[PDB]
């Protein structure tokens with residue numbers, strides 16, 4: 001639906017809103033999902049669960065590398 005460069009630009013716009021300008025906090029992931037990919041939230045997982053899954057290193061932030069796990073969902 002979007003090229004990888006276009007997806008990075010959406011990530012970047014939401015990641016710069018608070019805290020780490022290059023990573024997403026849970027609130028930033030919520031804003032991105034609600035605005036751009038709303039079907040991702042009416043799924044089996046809650047936002048807390050999705051955040052916990054994406055955040056592999058457990059640092060409370062989702063990097064662009066971590067965010068890649070969502071692209072199959074988004075693309076398909």
Ligand SMILES: [Ca+2]
Pocket residue numbers: 014015016017018019020021022023024025028
């Ligand atoms: Ca951020």
Ligand SMILES: [Ca+2]
Pocket residue numbers: 054055056057058059060061062063066
């Ligand atoms: Ca992380």
